[PDB]
Every structure is written in C-alpha cells, then in structure tokens.
Amino acid sequence: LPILLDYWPSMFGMRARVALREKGVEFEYREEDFSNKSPLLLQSNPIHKKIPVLVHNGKPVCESLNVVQYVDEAWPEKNPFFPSDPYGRAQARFWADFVDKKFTDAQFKVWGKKGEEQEAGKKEFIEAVKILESELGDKPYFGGDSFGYVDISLITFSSWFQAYEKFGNFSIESESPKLIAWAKRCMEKESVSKSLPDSEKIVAYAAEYRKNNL
Amino acid sequence: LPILLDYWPSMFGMRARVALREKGVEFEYREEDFSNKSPLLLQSNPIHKKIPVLVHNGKPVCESLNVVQYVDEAWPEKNPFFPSDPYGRAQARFWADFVDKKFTDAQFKVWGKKGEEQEAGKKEFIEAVKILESELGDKPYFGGDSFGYVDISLITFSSWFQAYEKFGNFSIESESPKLIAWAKRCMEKESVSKSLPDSEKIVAYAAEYRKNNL
Amino acid sequence: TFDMNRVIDEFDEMTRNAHQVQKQTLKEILLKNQSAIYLQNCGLNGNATDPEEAFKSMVPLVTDVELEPYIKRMVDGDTSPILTGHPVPAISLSSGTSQGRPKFIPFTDELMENTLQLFRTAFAFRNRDFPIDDNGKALQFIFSSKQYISTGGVPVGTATTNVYRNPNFKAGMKSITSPSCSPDEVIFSPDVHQALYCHLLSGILFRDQVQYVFAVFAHGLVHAFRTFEQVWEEIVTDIKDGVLSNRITVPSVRTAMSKLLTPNPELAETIRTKCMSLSNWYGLIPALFPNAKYVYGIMTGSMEPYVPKLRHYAGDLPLVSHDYGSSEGWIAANVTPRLSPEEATFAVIPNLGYFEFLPVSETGEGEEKPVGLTQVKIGEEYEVVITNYAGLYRYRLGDVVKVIGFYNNTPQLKFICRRNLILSINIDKNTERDLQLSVESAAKRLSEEKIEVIDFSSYIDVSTDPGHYAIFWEISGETNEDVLQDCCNCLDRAFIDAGYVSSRKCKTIGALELRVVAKGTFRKIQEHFLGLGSSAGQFKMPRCVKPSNAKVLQILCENVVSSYFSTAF
Ligand SMILES: Nc1ncnc2c1ncn2[C@@H]1O[C@H](COP(=O)(O)OP(=O)(O)OP(=O)(O)O)[C@@H](O)[C@H]1O
Numbered sequence: 001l002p003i004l005l006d007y008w009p010s011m012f013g014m015r016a017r018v019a020l021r022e023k024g025v026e027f028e029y030r031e032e033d034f035s036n037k038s039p040l041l042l043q044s045n046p047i048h049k050k051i052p053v054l055v056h057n058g059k060p061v062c063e064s065l066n067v068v069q070y071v072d073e074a075w076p077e078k079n080p081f082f083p084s085d086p087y088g089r090a091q092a093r094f095w096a097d098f099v100d101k102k103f104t105d106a107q108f109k110v111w112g113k114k115g116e117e118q119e120a121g122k123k124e125f126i127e128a129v130k131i132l133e134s135e136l137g138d139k140p141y142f143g144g145d146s147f148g149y150v151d152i153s154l155i156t157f158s159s160w161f162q163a164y165e166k167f168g169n170f171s172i173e174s175e176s177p178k179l180i181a182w183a184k185r186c187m188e189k190e191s192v193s194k195s196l197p198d199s200e201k202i203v204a205y206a207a208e209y210r211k212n213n214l
Numbered sequence: 215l216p217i218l219l220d221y222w223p224s225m226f227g228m229r230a231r232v233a234l235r236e237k238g239v240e241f242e243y244r245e246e247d248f249s250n251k252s253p254l255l256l257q258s259n260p261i262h263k264k265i266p267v268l269v270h271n272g273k274p275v276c277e278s279l280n281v282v283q284y285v286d287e288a289w290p291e292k293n294p295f296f297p298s299d300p301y302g303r304a305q306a307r308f309w310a311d312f313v314d315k316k317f318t319d320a321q322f323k324v325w326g327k328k329g330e331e332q333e334a335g336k337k338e339f340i341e342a343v344k345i346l347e348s349e350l351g352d353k354p355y356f357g358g359d360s361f362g363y364v365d366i367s368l369i370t371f372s373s374w375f376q377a378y379e380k381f382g383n384f385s386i387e388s389e390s391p392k393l394i395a396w397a398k399r400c401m402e403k404e405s406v407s408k409s410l411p412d413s414e415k416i417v418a419y420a421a422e423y424r425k426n427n428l
Numbered sequence: 429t430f431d432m433n434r435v436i437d438e439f440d441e442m443t444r445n446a447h448q449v450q451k452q453t454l455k456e457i458l459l460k461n462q463s464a465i466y467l468q469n470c471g472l473n474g475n476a477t478d479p480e481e482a483f484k485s486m487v488p489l490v491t492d493v494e495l496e497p498y499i500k501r502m503v504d505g506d507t508s509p510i511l512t513g514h515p516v517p518a519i520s521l522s523s524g525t526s527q528g529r530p531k532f533i534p535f536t537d538e539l540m541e542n543t544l545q546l547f548r549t550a551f552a553f554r555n556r557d558f559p560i561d562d563n564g565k566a567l568q569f570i571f572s573s574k575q576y577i578s579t580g581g582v583p584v585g586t587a588t589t590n591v592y593r594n595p596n597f598k599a600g601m602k603s604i605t606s607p608s609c610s611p612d613e614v615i616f617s618p619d620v621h622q623a624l625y626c627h628l629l630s631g632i633l634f635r636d637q638v639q640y641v642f643a644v645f646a647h648g649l650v651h652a653f654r655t656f657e658q659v660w661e662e663i664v665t666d667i668k669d670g671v672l673s674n675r676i677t678v679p680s681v682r683t684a685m686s687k688l689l690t691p692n693p694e695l696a697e698t699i700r701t702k703c704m705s706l707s708n709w710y711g712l713i714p715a716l717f718p719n720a721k722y723v724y725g726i727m728t729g730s731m732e733p734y735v736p737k738l739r740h741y742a743g744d745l746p747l748v749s750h751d752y753g754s755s756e757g758w759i760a761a762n763v764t765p766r767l768s769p770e771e772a773t774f775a776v777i778p779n780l781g782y783f784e785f786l787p788v789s790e791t792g793e794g795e796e797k798p799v800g801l802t803q804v805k806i807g808e809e810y811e812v813v814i815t816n817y818a819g820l821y822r823y824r825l826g827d828v829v830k831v832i833g834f835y836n837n838t839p840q841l842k843f844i845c846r847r848n849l850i851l852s853i854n855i856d857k858n859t860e861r862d863l864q865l866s867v868e869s870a871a872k873r874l875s876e877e878k879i880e881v882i883d884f885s886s887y888i889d890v891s892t893d894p895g896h897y898a899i900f901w902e903i904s905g906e907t908n909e910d911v912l913q914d915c916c917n918c919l920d921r922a923f924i925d926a927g928y929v930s931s932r933k934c935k936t937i938g939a940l941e942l943r944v945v946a947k948g949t950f951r952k953i954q955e956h957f958l959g960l961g962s963s964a965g966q967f968k969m970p971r972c973v974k975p976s977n978a979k980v981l982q983i984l985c986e987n988v989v990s991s992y993f994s995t996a997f
C-alpha cells in the first residue's frame with residue numbers, strides 16, 4: 001500500500017492527500033510529530049526531513065508538487081490532471097510554480113508575521129489572489145477542463161483562508177471573490193473533502209505559532 | 215520557428231538553449247534587456263516578467279525547467295531526456311527541485327553576497343555539490359542512458375563554476391573532481407558548447423554585480 | 429562504532445539475506461549509474477519488473493580491450509564520465525595484459541565505505557578467534573607513500589595508496605585495528621626500501637604489545653623476514669648511537685627517525701643475543717613478539733609456495749588466510765580466520781557488487797550461459813564475472829574459482845589458481861625479453877654492491893614534448909646516485925632494437941628516465957592483485973605501461989628514491 005508521511009496542517013501534505021484520492025487510490029496516512037521525524041522518513045529524506053512523503057515499491061517520493069506528479073505517472077489510465085498538449089502542461093506547471101513562490105510566502109507573511117512584515121504580506125497575497133482570479137477567468141478549473149494538477153496545488157491553501165482572514169483582519173473575498181468562491185466549489189470532490197482538516201484547528205495552529213513567537 | 219527570449223548571463227536561459235541545441239531544433243535567440251524589455255515578454259508574461267519564454271505554435275511556455283519538460287514531450291521522437299519508468303522520473307523532478315532551490319540559493323550568495331553569506335554559501339555549496347556527488351556516486355548523465363533532464367539543469371552552472379571558484383576561494387575540482395569534470399564532459403557536446411557562454415564574460419558580470427551592488 | 433557481536437549479526441543477516449542484497453545491490457548500482465554510455469547502447473532505463481533479466485539479456489560480456497579506450501578518455505585531458513559514471517577520483521590497473529596492453533579501471537567513494545565495513549567484519553571475526561589488546565599496536569608491512577596524477581591533472585591510482593591517502597581512514601581505523609608503530613610519514617616516506625627496514629624497526633619497537641605481523645602475503649613477510657635476514661644493524665647500530673645509519677638519506681624520514689633517537693648501549697646486548705642463539709630462525713615472528721596470536725595474510729593458491737618459508741619464519745605461530753577482494757572488486761572475507769592455509773576458504777560478501785559466474789563444465793571451454801552466485805553448484809568451478817561500482821558490468825575477469833561450501837545462505841570460494849591469462853602481442857615493448865634484459869644488463873652495475881633486483885617496469889609519458897620514457901626499478905638495497913644514473917643509461921643501451929634508437933637519437937621521444945623505486949613496491953603490486961576480486965591468479969604483470977595503466981602509476985611518482993635523466997645524449 002502507498003505509504004504517506006503527513007502533517008495534519010501541512011498544506012503540501014494535503015497536496016499529496018488531495019492528489020492520490022482524486023485519481024482513485026486507497027492509501028494510508030501517517031501523522032508526524034516533527035519533533036521525532038520518522039525512521040522511515042529520515043531514511044526517505046535525511047537532509048530535508050520534510051513531508052508529504054509517498055512510498056511505493058519500497059521507494060520514497062518527496063515534494064508536494066512532485067508527489068502529485070508521481071500520482072499521475074504511476075497509474076495513467078483513469079484520471080489525468082494534465083491536458084494532452086505539452087503547452088497546457090507548461091501553463092499548468094507554470095501556474096504550479098506561481099503558488100509556491102510569492103503566493104506561499106505571502107500567506108506565510110499574513111499569518112506568520114506582523115507589522116511592517118504583515119502589511120507587506122497582505123498586499124502580496126491580495127495581489128496574487130487578483131492575478132489568480134484573472135487567470136481563472138471563466139474556467140471551472142485551472143489545470144484542465146475538469147480537475148487539474150494545479151487545482152490540487154492551491155486548493156489546499158483555502159482552509160488557511162480563515163486564518164488569513166482573522167489575523168489579517170481582512171476579507172479576501174470582497175476584493176477578489178471568485179478564487180475563494182472556486183475553492184469551496186472544489187471542496188465537492190471527495191479527495192479534498194476527506195483530506196483537509198478543519199479550519200478552526202488550522203486557525204488555532206496558526207494562533208499557536210503566533211502566541212509563541214511574539 | 216519557436217522564439218526564445220533569453221538573458222545571456224541567466225543560467226536558466228542557457229538550459230532552454232541547451233535543450234533546443236541538444237534536440238537539433240533550430241530557433242531564433244532573443245536577447246532581453248531588463249531596462250527596455252520587448253513587448254512579447256510583457257505580453258507572454260504579464261506579471262512575472264521572467265526569461266526564458268518559448269513561443270511555439272503561437273503559444274508561449276514559461277519557466278526554463280518547464281521549457282525543458284515541455285520541450286521533452288513536444289518532441290519525444292528523437293531524444294528522451296527522461297527515463298520510461300515513472301519512478302526514475304520520480305528522482306527527476308525531485309533532483310531538478312533540489313538543484314533549483316538549495317543549489318541556486320547557495321551559489322547566489324557566493325557570487326552575489328559578502329561576509330558571512332559568502333562563508334555560509336561556501337560550506338553549503340560544497341556540501342550541496344558533495345551531496346550530488348555522493349548520491350549520484352558513479353553516473354555519467356543524470357537523466358537517462360543519454361543526456362539527462364537534470365544534467366541540462368545542472369550543466370548551466372558549469373559556466374559559473376569558475377566565478378564560484380574565484381569568489382568563494384574554493385576549488386570544486388579538488389574536493390569533488392567528478393562534478394567539475396562532469397562539467398568538462400558535457401562541454402564536448404555541442405549543446406553545452408554553443409549554449410554556454412564563455413567563462414570570462416559571466417565572471418566579469420558576477421564581478422560587475424559586486425561593484426554594482428552594495 | 430566497532431563492536432564484535434552486533435557486526436557479526438548484521439553480516440550474518442545479510443549473508444543469509446544474500447538474494448535480496450545481491451539483487452538490491454545491482455539495482456542500487458543501476459539506480460546510481462542509470463546513464464552509462466555502455467548501458468545506453470545496450471538500452472537500459474532502470475526500474476522495471478524484469479531489471480535483472482534485462483541486465484543479462486540486453487548487456488553483453490566484455491573484455492579489457494574494448495573497455496580500455498573508453499576509460500582512456502577519463503584520464504587523458506578529457507576528465508569526462510564513461511563506462512561507470514562521473515569522473516573518477518583515480519584509475520586502476522590489472523595484472524596480465526589487455527591485448528598485451530595495459531589495463532584500466534576507475535574507483536568511487538562508496539568502495540571506501542566498503543573498505544571500512546569489510547575490515548571491520550574480517551577483523552571482528554578474527555578477533556573473536558584471536559582477541560587483541562585495545563592498547564596494543566601492529567607491525568604491518570604496508571605502504572602507500574606514493575601518489576601520481578594523470579595527464580588531465582587527475583590522480584590515477586592504486587588500492588594501497590588511495591585507501592591510506594583518503595581522509596576517512598585514520599579516523600575510521602582506530603577501533604577495529606591496532607595503531608601502527610610506523611609514523612604515517614614513514615609509511616608516507618619518499619623512500620620505501622629505507623622506510624621498510626624502518627617499518628621493521630617500527631613493528632618490533634612495541635613488540636610485547638603487538639598482536640601480529642602482517643603482510644597481505646607471505647612473500648612480503650618472507651621478503652621482510654628474508655629482510656629480517658636483509659636488515660638488522662642499521663636499526664641496532666643506528667638506534668644505538670642515537671643516530672640513524674647513513675644509508676638513510678631522506679630528510680622527512682630522517683627528521684622522524686631523529687626525533688626518536690638517543691644513545692642506548694644495553695639493548696644491543698639483548699637484541700643481539702637472542703638472535704644468533706636459535707636454529708633456522710624457526711619462529712622468526714614468535715621470537716620477535718611471542719605475544720602475537722597469529723600470522724596474517726593470503727597464503728592460498730600462488731602464495732602457497734611462499735607459506736613454507738613464512739611457516740619456517742612463523743614456527744608454531746598460526747598462519748591466517750586473509751580475505752579476497754580489491755579496488756576492481758571485493759568478493760570474499762574470512763569469518764573463519766582460525767582455518768589453516770591449506771584448508772583456507774573464503775566467504776563472498778553480499779552488498780559489494782553483483783557477481784555472475786561462467787561455468788567451465790563440459791571440457792574446455794564448453795558453451796554455457798552465466799548463472800546466479802547462489803545457483804553455482806557446490807564443488808564445481810566457474811569463471812568469475814564481476815559487476816560493481818568500479819565500473820565493470822558483466823566483465824569477465826578470466827579466473828577459475830572453486831565452491832567449497834556455504835556459510836548459511838552465502839557461498840564459499842577457494843583458490844588453487846596459477847595465472848588466469850593468455851598473452852597477446854604487446855605494445856609497450858621493446859620485448860619483455862629486452863625489458864627484462866634491459867633491467868638485467870643495467871642491474872649488474874648495482875650488483876657490484878652485490879644487491880639483486882626483485883622487480884621492474886616501464887612507462888611512456890606523452891604529456892611532455894618530447895614524450896619521455898620512464899623505467900621503474902625495484903632492488904633489495906640502497907646505493908649512491910652515480911650508479912643509478914649509469915643504470916638509466918644502460919636501460920636505453922640495453923633495449924637492443926633499431927627503432928628505439930632512431931628516435932631517442934632523434935629525440936622525438938625523451939631520453940629514457942630511470943626512476944629508481946624502493947623495494948617491495950612491485951611486491952605491493954602482488955599485494956593488491958592476488959588479493960584482487962576474482963580468483964587468486966592475477967600474477968602476470970604488464971612490464972611497461974602506456975597511458976593505459978594507472979594503478980602502477982600512482983605508485984610511481986612520489987617514491988622516486990632516485991629520479992634521473994641520462995647524462996649522455
Ligand atoms: N569493493 C570494493 N571495490 C573497490 N574498492 C574497494 C572495495 N572495498 C574496498 N575497496 C577499497 O578501494 C580502496 C582503494 O582502492 P582503489 O579502488 O583506490 O584503487 P583503484 O584506482 O580503484 O584501483 P587499483 O587498486 O586496482 O589501482 C581500497 O582501500 C580498497 O580496500
């Protein structure tokens with residue numbers, strides 16, 4: 001069985017979690033105390049020591065975007081996230097690269113940092129939620145006509161939207177309504193529905209990190 | 215004919231250049247100046263404005279690695295950059311991702327920073343380079359029986375191997391003969407030979423970066 | 429972290445786990461080396477569900493000659509990857525000849541981890557049969573004082589030299605072996621033959637403490653105990669007077685030896701007395717150090733005739749067969765050290781590489797395809813084919829081995845070997861006769877000192893313009909420079925052929941340089957060779973090396989006891 005090393009609030013874990021179940025695989029999840037990184041995990045990733053980690057054929061796969069790629073390529077017979085054309089693949093990989101750079105740090109700034117850093121981050125994430133909404137355009141889903149590779153990549157950030165709203169003391173929806181709109185629409189798929197932990201819990205994990213590092 | 219918008223000193227641009235020369239697919243090179251960037255780069259990339267962008271079929275692909283991944287599948291008839299197996303390609307994306315962040319972060323400190331950053335970058339770089347060496351162990355090309363996906367991706371840093379030696383005060387040959395001389399093998403190939411600019415120009419450029427940037 | 433019981437168990441488990449670790453090893457070698465050009469033409473991508481079947485079917489058996497021109501490319505200026513993979517830290521050589529031409533092989537770092545694991549186990553198991561003091565040291569005639577570089581500025585290298593030169597080994601040697609008596613500098617001394625009697629000095633120094641005499645083979649012990657014949661003042665007279673004997677002319681070894689010299693007269697009385705009081709030097713070794721539990725090295729097959737002498741030297745002291753394997757390949761280690769040389773047998777190590785054996789069963793040769801190492805039938809002898817990180821895949825070594833039995837799920841192999849070789853027309857000649865004649869005619873000059881030459885060799889350097897020849901000379905005893913200069917002249921003068929003459933007279937190729945090397949170096953070239961992963965026989969050594977031989981090369985440069993060009997011409 002496909003072995004997962006996952007973190008309850010790791011959005012990237014979710015990206016693996018969201019990907020596997022999407023395509024149609026029965027898998028196991030292991031919860032990680034990062035204090036004590038797993039013996040199979042350190043064997044899977046000694047230097048990075050990071051998750052999500054999917055293990056197949058006694059072999060470790062690492063990085064979230066990478067894990068969703070492993071997911072597609074390992075049983076390419078039922079559910080492909082990518083379009084047939086190489087270029088649509090390129091756009092999708094491009095759009096996957098977008099979420100990771102400024103988009104991830106921005107939210108990291110919005111619920112991870114305060115003040116001078118905070119407002120910088122909030123202008124950053126609203127800029128990206130704007131870029132995001134415009135690239136979506138009319139689409140049901142970024143990656144393809146149906147569920148996409150990159151749909152899987154940023155759908156997981158949507159549970160942190162509550163965290164972004166509360167510490168951020170801002171409403172992301174009123175300035176960019178359709179991204180957040182689309183995300184609860186994506187929730188309907190069973191993969192994202194079962195994989196994603198509660199937002200109050202995430203909010204409280206974010207609080208836990210805030211309260212400690214003031 | 216696909217048009218590539220490229221920065222001569224940018225390493226990612228070289229990789230796209232290597233890719234098209236490795237395949238034997240003719241292209242027109244376009245030099246982009248950050249000062250007055252062409253309408254196409256701004257048109258192809260509205261937000262990110264980053265080289266190298268390839269336009270094929272009047273469809274522009276962005277990111278260099280993407281250019282590479284897109285380039286491999288859009289012409290898979292003559293040269294395969296990737297192995298046939300999904301898991302061999304599992305190491306592929308992981309190792310591309312490895313070299314793309316840590317390696318790029320280490321080296322940028324070496325040619326683009328001063329004081330402790332150099333020192334931290336040195337040991338980090340030497341370790342990174344060591345990790346490649348130790349993990350790879352005894353491999354002629356990273357990506358498959360011929361030239362490989364992460365060969366190309368890592369080979370672009372070969373141009374900068376001597377600017378890194380000089381600025382860092384460390385010989386990448388001496389501690390790790392294999393990687394520096396893995397760079398010399400690839401130089402014999404016309405791909406790396408004609409897509410990789412002369413050592414002397416980029417070291418001045420990196421040196422110029424020192425004079426220019428305080 | 430060395431420990432007796434846990435290491436046994438780990439290796440117990442993996443030898444019993446032979447099939448998994450054999451198949452995982454081949455896979456882990458292929459994982460690390462999936463891009464070999466050699467592999468490329470064969471057509472491998474790794475993974476799959478029939479990788480081992482694909483490996484046997486899609487890849488052909490290979491000889492030294494077609495792999496030569498490949499690994500040549502690594503060393504000559506192009507530092508590029510080839511049969512194996514990435515640019516090699518240095519380059520191997522083999523006994524016998526690759527079409528009458530020099531052999532070539534690369535090494536990697538993983539086989540350095542292999543060094544540390546393999547001595548641990550062999551030494552652990554021997555120490556269970558023969559436990560040893562933690563504060564004791566060891567007299568080991570082992571030397572690695574010489575390091576050469578390829579034309580590409582890349583070291584090309586021998587077992588001995590590289591292992592000891594590599595950074596991890598003094599740190600990694602502390603708890604599995606007795607600290608060497610000899611300073612690393614006298615091990616790393618520019619003059620081995622001088623350092624060798626000083627190595628004797630060294631090993632005897634802490635004699636009550638030393639747990640063994642050690643050479644890789646009896647011949648070295650013999651050589652050394654025939655050097656026990658061949659030295660013993662110098663030491664006494666030079667350790668006596670607090671001044672090293674004047675025979676020693678090298679500063680580094682002079683400084684080291686000097687720091688430890690003060691004038692002691694009572695001991696001469698003692699060292700002397702014992703030594704002329706006994707019959708035959710029967711029991712050399714127990715006489716030196718009574719305390720040594722055993723004699724160590726490889727006593728089987730071809731060193732078997734050198735065993736009587738050792739035994740004569742060894743007296744009642746037990747003779748222990750040493751493990752079998754090398755830079756190209758390591759196969760077997762002794763976990764039953766107690767066993768005698770005659771009954772000696774060897775246990776293949778599982779994670780070192782992938783090994784296929786070609787059966788010799790029918791008459792000669794008989795036509796049979798390769799079978800699994802475990803599949804090899806007990807009692808029957810197969811040719812050895814070796815796949816490992818040294819970069820040979822499905823390469824036939826040319827040696828016959830015998831299966832005596834099985835240690836749990838792992839096979840045992842024994843050696844009665846002579847020379848696993850056939851000759852081809854050479855390219856470094858200047859016929860061996862001539863080269864042997866060359867050495868012989870010039871050696872006479874050093875024979876006025878009544879010292880005889882044990883072994884010799886030659887080299888062509890095409891880096892320099894004009895390319896210059898290099899002769900390597902191994903003689904039992906030290907002498908002045910004028911006579912070696914004369915000898916270099918005669919080597920030129922001794923090659924009797926016309927064509928040699930037209931060119932060195934025309935000087936398109938440089939004056940033949942005779943670089944006199946120190947004693948036991950070519951013996952060292954027996955030391956890693958019979959030890960060489962294969963089957964014992966590896967005893968024909970190519971006499972002159974083109975840029976196609978590299979193990980001998982590393983040996984050649986740094987221990988130039990004397991390095992000179994012909995004053996004539
Ligand atoms: N399995 C193995 N394969 C190769 N080398 C091994 C293995 N195990 C240990 N070694 C060690 O490799 C180290 C160095 O030998 P080395 O490989 O450097 O020289 P080389 O250029 O490969 O070849 P050679 O000795 O034939 O010239 C030794 O200390 C040797 O013990």
Ligand SMILES: N[C@@H](CCC(=O)N[C@@H](CS)C(=O)NCC(=O)O)C(=O)O
Nearest residue numbers: 010012034049050051052063064065
């Ligand atoms: N590129 C990685 C990044 C993973 C990452 O940031 N992981 C965090 C979880 S938030 C982690 O594993 N941190 C290590 C730790 O907490 O010790 C991926 O997408 O898998």
Ligand SMILES: N[C@@H](CCC(=O)N[C@@H](CS)C(=O)NCC(=O)O)C(=O)O
Nearest residue numbers: 224225226248264265266277278279
């Ligand atoms: N994500 C793209 C863009 C990478 C990137 O940031 N490249 C540098 C070139 S070194 C760049 O474009 N810098 C633009 C700038 O300096 O403003 C890639 O990986 O190629």
Ligand SMILES: CC/C=C\C[C@H]1C(=O)CC[C@@H]1CC(=O)O
Nearest residue numbers: 543546547644751752753956959
């Ligand atoms: C690293 C293993 C230690 C044992 C091996 C080395 C020795 O200690 C003697 C030789 C041997 C190599 C050989 O068999 O050639």
Ligand code: MET
Nearest residue numbers: 587588644952955956959
């Ligand atoms: C004791 S370390 C290795 C010794 C080996 N017999 C050699 O001569 O290379």
